[PDB]
Design a protein around this nucleic acid. Structure first.
Length: 49
DNA sequence: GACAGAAAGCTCAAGTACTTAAGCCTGGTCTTTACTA
């Protein structure tokens, strides 16, 4: 049944329990932004990493 | 003066030196100086 309106769904959906894994990769460890931060010593260019 | 031989020359196959080798990103760990003097 549709969660929003309560109407039945015309197609019949395949459902069941399946074993799922959470992986090490998370967005909080990958999100990054830069604006006039640290400057490399030799090239006077933005840092790496 | 006509031939042949010995010449410098020239070109053409093998061998050698040198080059590049995807893009971005995240971590971790280790180490710069150990050894003779």
């Amino acid at each position: 049944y549709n969660g929003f309106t309560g109407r039945k769904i015309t197609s019949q959906i395949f459902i069941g329990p399946t074993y799922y894994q959470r992986l090490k990769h998370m967005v909080d460890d990958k999100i990054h932004s830069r604006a006039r931060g640290p400057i490399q010593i030799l090239n006077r260019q933005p840092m790496e990493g």
